[PDB]
Amino acid sequence: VAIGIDLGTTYSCVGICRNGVVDIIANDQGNRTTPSYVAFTDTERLIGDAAKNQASRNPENTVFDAKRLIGRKFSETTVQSDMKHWPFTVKGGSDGKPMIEVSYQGEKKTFHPEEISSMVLKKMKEVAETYLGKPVKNAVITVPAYFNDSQRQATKDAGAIAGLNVLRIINEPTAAAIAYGLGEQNILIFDLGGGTFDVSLLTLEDGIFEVKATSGDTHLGGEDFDNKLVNFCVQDFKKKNGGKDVSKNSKSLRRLRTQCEKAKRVLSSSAQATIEVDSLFDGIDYNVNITRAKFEELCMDQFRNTLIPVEKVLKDAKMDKSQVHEIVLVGGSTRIPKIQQLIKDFFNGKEPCKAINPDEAVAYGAAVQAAILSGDQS
Numbered sequence: 001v002a003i004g005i006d007l008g009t010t011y012s013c014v015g016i017c018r019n020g021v022v023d024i025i026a027n028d029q030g031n032r033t034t035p036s037y038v039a040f041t042d043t044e045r046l047i048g049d050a051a052k053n054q055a056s057r058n059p060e061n062t063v064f065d066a067k068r069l070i071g072r073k074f075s076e077t078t079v080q081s082d083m084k085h086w087p088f089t090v091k092g093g094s095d096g097k098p099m100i101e102v103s104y105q106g107e108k109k110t111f112h113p114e115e116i117s118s119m120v121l122k123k124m125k126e127v128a129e130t131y132l133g134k135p136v137k138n139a140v141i142t143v144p145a146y147f148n149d150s151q152r153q154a155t156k157d158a159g160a161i162a163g164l165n166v167l168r169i170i171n172e173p174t175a176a177a178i179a180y181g182l183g184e185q186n187i188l189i190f191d192l193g194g195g196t197f198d199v200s201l202l203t204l205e206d207g208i209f210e211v212k213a214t215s216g217d218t219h220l221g222g223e224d225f226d227n228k229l230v231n232f233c234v235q236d237f238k239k240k241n242g243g244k245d246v247s248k249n250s251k252s253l254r255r256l257r258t259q260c261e262k263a264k265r266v267l268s269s270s271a272q273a274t275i276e277v278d279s280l281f282d283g284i285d286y287n288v289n290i291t292r293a294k295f296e297e298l299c300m301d302q303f304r305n306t307l308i309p310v311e312k313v314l315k316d317a318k319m320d321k322s323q324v325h326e327i328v329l330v331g332g333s334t335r336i337p338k339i340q341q342l343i344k345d346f347f348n349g350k351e352p353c354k355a356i357n358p359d360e361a362v363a364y365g366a367a368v369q370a371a372i373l374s375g376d377q378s
């Protein structure tokens with residue numbers, strides 16, 4: 001028995017390929033993906049939905065973004081940039097590795113990034129075990145195509161810490177292509193997730209995939225679209241509440257961001273949505289209606305700029321966009337209709353591969369590869 005695990009920047013996903021078909025496994029709360037969050041409380045260690053749902057109440061001890069630190073040295077310039085985002089403490093050890101400091105059961109505990117990720121993997125493992133009713137040990141784990149040897153080995157080590165026999169580390173874009181069962185074929189993976197954007201151009205030759213070029217933006221994702229709605233709501237609240245500034249309270253903002261993300265999802269299938277927060281700031285209730293057009297308007301420049309990395313990978317691959325045989329939409333943010341419209345137009349009306357829920361495709365393909373590596377050629 002071998003599973004496929006997408007260890008995602010913001011959400012992870014686990015699937016299993018049995019008898020040639022892939023079942024993505026929902027977790028305790030019925031969610032087919034699980035937040036890559038770990039929280040420490042006076043009494044318990046929380047992972048996934050429970051961790052994220054409690055983040056606003058305990059930001060200092062709720063850890064996320066471990067993928068941004070795994071396999072890196074603390075001094076790298078990316079860590080210095082990324083950290084003004086994290087409410088949790090990160091320090092450098094003697095070896096120079098990042099140490100995530102939190103409080104757990106009234107005590108101070110430090111964890112390496114791969115130890116945090118091992119906790120997320122262990123959760124996904126248990127999710128599969130509950131669904132299967134039997135233990136699981138073998139697994140394939142995916143990583144971004146640009147991950148280096150240290151980041152990959154640290155991800156493999158996280159698997160071993162979680163009790164998993166890691167059969168192979170594989171590239172996220174190649175997993176997505178495998179999911180779709182894709183002569184030479186030029187394949188463009190457009191992966192717009194919760195915190196990151198990755199564009200990869202692949203070639204399929206004799207059933208063998210080759211990554212020809214990659215680009216993207218490590219700080220463009222759904223969360224940034226949430227923040228445009230948050231900025232709008234902060235200005236709106238000020239206009240109707242005598243200039244009171246909600247942004248000065250971190251809890252209020254986080255409560256507001258949570259509702260902005262919810263409404264954003266609604267706007268992917270409805271023409272408008274409501275953002276509602278009772279007692280948001282002071283004792284003042286907040287309520288606003290957001291149309292798809294206004295949401296699109298607020299994010300247009302960011303939506304438009306997703307195409308610049310697409311042009312770059314094609315430039316680097318010495319390839320004209322008309323030579324792309326398939327466009328694969330990965331990442332939950334590719335559910336936004338305006339994003340899909342921009343991609344299709346850029347590729348002159350070519351319909352993209354999107355039938356597989358975009359936040360599951362990576363786990364989907366990973367599970368396929370896990371089955372094949374287990375001797376199951378079904």
Ligand SMILES: Nc1ncnc2c1ncn2[C@@H]1O[C@H](COP(=O)(O)OP(=O)(O)O)[C@@H](O)[C@H]1O
Nearest residue numbers: 008009010011193194222265268331332333359
């Ligand atoms: N229907 C939807 N419309 C717009 N965005 C969505 C929708 N569903 C999920 N998302 C977004 O997708 C993101 C998560 O994508 P995911 O693929 O899990 O990210 P990652 O793989 O980087 O962890 C979140 O920002 C979330 O808001």
Ligand SMILES: [Mg+2]
Nearest residue numbers: 006008011012
């Ligand atoms: Mg993911």
